[PDB]
């Protein structure tokens, strides 16, 4: 019966710009102040900016001061956030939030958010690196090996072992989005220590989006 | 940002009660009022508690908040799987001149029983080193509840630069798993005696350590 709805989320390059909008309804928009709060992927909330009820008074986090620009059009019930010179740090979900300061500070109604992904990076095939034997006194125990898939875009890559012949003891981890904006993951598989001497292990890494396939043998260290 | 200090992860069984603490200073919690936000995974934050101890209408009486000096507290009785979420503590900081929040506390309603994390720290490959790059790889698996703290050591000095770590996602065995990557120069790797990955699950820590030679 009352809500805020963010729009204009997009991908932009480093040094680029972008205008976020927030449509409001169910209340007198100009009767309350507003706020932009952002959530970097897998990090905590961070306040960005806020604007007065009159619509004339603007405050900013020291991180976004002089680069971002809060604004509102009370005739059309809309908040906006002009973001200039955007850098990698700015990548997050941006939620428009109604601000209420009766007694103390609290944001009493949020939108669904909208993603902004500053990217210097386009479509890149992965580099594939050979994981250590890790014969670090595991003795009779399970000794496991793997492959590093580094600096590929966009998702996803697929990993198989000995062309999919070996799948028992395999663990392939989700990728990380790096500060570069570039995806990296690893796939590890545990086969007996004694077997290493006379068993070949090769990870097959296929990146459909760059049509890169790499076969990479992995066997002890010196 | 994590201006305010919250505990990364708290856990309880359905029907029980939990308290989440928020640590600050004079400039923030000291003189100004605190609020609590529930972010259900994927969805936006929602106002839970405002003005230290006030609930919006429709937020149940299970939820309550307290504050004294430079710390505040969120109480939840009658725990249910629905409450399983990330919890944020929010106030005003006058010395930063900015609205500030805690790093956020992940809640894990205990359905299945706990498991201790297995850590496997592969070092930079000879191959990678020759390419003028060096990635320490920390693989963490078979733990519950789905919330860990990952710390990195250059010898015995803490390292938070060049660190990227995954959000815990359950693999085919209904158990959480995550990964952390430390980016070094070949010089950094060779100019230290050892590097270590410390994974802190609940009250415990498992550390793995790697030597260049």
Author numbering:
A (entry chain III): 1 to 52, 52A, 53 to 82, 82A, 82B, 82C, 83 to 100, 100A, ...
B (entry chain MMM): 2 to 27, 27A, 27B, 28 to 95, 95A, 95B, 96 to 210
What do the authors report?
C0020187 is a human monoclonal antibody specific for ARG2 that was derived from phage-display selections on naïve libraries of scFvs based on human Ig variable regions. We wanted to improve the affinity and potency of C0020187 to enhance its efficacy in vivo. The parental antibody, C0020187, showed inhibition to human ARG2 with an IC50 of ∼890 nM, with an inhibition curve that lies to the left of the small-molecule inhibitor NHLA (NG-hydroxy-ʟ-arginine [Millipore]).
The high-affinity complex of Fab C0020187 bound to trimeric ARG2 showed a surprising 1:3 stoichiometry (C0020187:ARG2) due to substantial negative cooperativity in antibody binding. A sample of this complex was purified by SEC prior to setting up crystallization trials; however, unexpectedly a 3:3 complex was found within the crystals obtained, perhaps reflecting the relatively high-protein concentrations required for crystallization. The asymmetric unit contained a trefoil-shaped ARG2 trimer and three Fabs, which were bound to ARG2 on very similar binding sites. The parental Fab C0020187 binds to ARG2 close to the active site, but does not appear to sterically block access, which suggests an allosteric mechanism of action. Antibody binding induces a large conformational change in several neighboring regions of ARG2 (residues 34 to 40, 71 to 88, and 150 to 159), with the first group of residues relatively close to the active site. The interface area between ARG2 and Fab C0020187 calculated by PISA is about 654 Å2 when averaged over the three interfaces in the asymmetric unit. Most interactions are between the regions of conformational change in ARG2 (interface residues 35 to 39, 78 to 86, 152 to 157, and 178 to 179) and CDRH2/CDRH3 and CDRL1/CDRL3. Residues within CDRH3 and CDRL3 form a hydrophobic cleft on the antibody surface, but surprisingly residues forming the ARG2 epitope do not insert deeply. Residues with the largest changes in accessible surface area on antibody-binding and located in the center of the interface include: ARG2 Y82 (van der Waals [vdW] interaction with VH L100a and π-stacking with VL W91), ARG2 L81 (vdW interaction with VL W91), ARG2 I86 (vdW interactions with VH A97 and VH L100a), and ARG2 L85 (vdW interaction with VH A97). There are also a number of strong polar interactions including H-bonds between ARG2 K78 and VL S95a, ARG2 N84 and VH Y58, and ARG2 S155 and VH S53.
